[PDB]
CSV table of C-alpha atoms and ligand atoms in Angstrom, one decimal:
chain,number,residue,atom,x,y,z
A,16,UNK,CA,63.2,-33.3,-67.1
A,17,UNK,CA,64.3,-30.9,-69.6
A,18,UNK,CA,62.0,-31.4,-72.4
A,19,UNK,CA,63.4,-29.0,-74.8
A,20,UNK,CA,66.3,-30.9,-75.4
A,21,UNK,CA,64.2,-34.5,-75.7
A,22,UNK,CA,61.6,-33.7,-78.0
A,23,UNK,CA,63.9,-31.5,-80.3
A,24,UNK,CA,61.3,-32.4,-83.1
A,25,UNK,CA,59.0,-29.6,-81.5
A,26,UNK,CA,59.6,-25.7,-81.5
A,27,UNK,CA,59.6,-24.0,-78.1
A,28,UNK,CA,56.1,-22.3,-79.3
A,29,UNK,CA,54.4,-25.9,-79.8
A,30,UNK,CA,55.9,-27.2,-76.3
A,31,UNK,CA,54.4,-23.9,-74.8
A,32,UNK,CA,51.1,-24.8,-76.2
A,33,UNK,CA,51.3,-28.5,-74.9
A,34,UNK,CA,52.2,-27.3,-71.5
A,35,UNK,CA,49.1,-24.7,-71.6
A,36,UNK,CA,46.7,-27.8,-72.7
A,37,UNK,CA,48.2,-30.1,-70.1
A,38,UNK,CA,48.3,-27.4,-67.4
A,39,UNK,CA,44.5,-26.4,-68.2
A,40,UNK,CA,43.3,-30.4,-68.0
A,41,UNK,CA,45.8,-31.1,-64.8
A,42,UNK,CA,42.5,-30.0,-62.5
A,43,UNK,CA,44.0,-31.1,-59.3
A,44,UNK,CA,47.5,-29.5,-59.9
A,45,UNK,CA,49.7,-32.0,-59.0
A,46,UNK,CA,51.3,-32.6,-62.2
A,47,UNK,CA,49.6,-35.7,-64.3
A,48,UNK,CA,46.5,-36.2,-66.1
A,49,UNK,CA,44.8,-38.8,-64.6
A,50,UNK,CA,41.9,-41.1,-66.4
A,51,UNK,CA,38.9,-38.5,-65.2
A,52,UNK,CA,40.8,-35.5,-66.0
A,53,UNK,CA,41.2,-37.4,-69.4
A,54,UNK,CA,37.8,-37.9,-69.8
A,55,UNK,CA,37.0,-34.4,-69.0
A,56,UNK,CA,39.3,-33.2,-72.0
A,57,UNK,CA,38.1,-35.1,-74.7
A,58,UNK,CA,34.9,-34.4,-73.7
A,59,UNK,CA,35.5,-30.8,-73.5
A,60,UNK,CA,37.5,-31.0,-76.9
A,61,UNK,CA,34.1,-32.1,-77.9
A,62,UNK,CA,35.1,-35.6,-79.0
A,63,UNK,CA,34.3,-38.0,-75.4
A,64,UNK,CA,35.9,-41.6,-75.3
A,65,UNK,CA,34.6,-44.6,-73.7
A,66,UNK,CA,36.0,-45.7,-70.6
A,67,UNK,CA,38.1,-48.4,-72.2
A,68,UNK,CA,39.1,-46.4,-75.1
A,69,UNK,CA,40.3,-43.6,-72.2
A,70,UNK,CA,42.3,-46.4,-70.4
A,71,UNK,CA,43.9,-47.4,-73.8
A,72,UNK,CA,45.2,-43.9,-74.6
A,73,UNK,CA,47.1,-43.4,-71.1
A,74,UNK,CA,48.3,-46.9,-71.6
A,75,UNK,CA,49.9,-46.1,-74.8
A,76,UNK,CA,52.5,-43.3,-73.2
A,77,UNK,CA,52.2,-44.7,-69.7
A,78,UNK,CA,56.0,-44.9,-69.6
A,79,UNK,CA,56.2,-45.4,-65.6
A,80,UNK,CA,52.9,-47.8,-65.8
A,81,UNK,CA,51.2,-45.5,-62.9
A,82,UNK,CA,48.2,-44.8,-64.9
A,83,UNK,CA,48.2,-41.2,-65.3
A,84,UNK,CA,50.1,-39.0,-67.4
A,85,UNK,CA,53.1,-36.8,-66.6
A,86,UNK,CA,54.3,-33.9,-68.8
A,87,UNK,CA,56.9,-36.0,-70.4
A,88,UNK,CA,53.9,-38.6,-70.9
A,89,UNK,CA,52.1,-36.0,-72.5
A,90,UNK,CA,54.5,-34.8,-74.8
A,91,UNK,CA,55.1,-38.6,-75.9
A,92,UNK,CA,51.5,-38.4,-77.1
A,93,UNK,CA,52.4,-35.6,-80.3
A,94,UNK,CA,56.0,-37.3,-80.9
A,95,UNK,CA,54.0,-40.3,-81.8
A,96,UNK,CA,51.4,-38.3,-83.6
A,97,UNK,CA,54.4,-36.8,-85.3
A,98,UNK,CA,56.2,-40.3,-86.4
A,99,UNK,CA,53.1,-41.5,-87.7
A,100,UNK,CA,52.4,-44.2,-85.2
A,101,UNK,CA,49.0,-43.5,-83.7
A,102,UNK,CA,45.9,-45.2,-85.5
A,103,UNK,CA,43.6,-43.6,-87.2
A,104,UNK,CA,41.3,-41.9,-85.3
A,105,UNK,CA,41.9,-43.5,-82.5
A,106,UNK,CA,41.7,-42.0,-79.2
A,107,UNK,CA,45.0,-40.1,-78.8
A,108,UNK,CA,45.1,-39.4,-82.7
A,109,UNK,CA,41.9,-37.1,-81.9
A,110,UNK,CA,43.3,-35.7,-79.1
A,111,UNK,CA,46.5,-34.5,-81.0
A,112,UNK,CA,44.4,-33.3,-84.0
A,113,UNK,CA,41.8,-31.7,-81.8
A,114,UNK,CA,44.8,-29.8,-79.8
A,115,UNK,CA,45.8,-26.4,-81.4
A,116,UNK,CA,49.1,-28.4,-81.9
A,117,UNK,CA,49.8,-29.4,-85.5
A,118,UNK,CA,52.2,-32.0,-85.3
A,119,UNK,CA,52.9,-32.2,-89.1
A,120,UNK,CA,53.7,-28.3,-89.9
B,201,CA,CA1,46.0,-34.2,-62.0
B,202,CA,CA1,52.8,-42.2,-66.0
């Protein structure tokens, strides 16, 4: 997984600074964000989700339907910040505002 050349949308800086926030939540260092570490990040960014609304935000990038999220995963979550497809508000559309990522510089 090269993800330079799939998410071509984002500068190497604003990959860098995904990596940094998915590297600082990945607690157990194996790679994915799993639905605790989740929870632990939004409530660290200081916006906590419900258990449900957690669920519903891996779901939404869960390309491999393993319930966690991989790099690639994660990345998946500002390219569709960036197209304009996350609801308002909703769980991953705080987490991508929330990030110092600005998806629509
Ligand atoms: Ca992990
Ligand atoms: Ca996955």
């Amino acid at each position: 997984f090269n993800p330079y050349t799939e998410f071509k949308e984002f500068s190497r800086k604003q990959i860098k600074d995904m990596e940094k926030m998915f590297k600082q939540y990945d607690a157990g260092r194996d790679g994915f964000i799993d639905l605790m570490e989740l929870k632990l990040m939004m409530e660290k960014l200081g916006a906590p989700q419900t258990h449900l609304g957690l669920k519903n935000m891996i779901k939404e990038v869960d390309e491999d339907f393993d319930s966690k999220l991989s790099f690639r995963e994660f990345l998946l979550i500002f390219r569709k910040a960036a197209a304009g497809e996350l609801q308002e508000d909703s769980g991953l559309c705080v987490l991508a505002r929330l990030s110092e990522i600005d998806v629509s510089s």
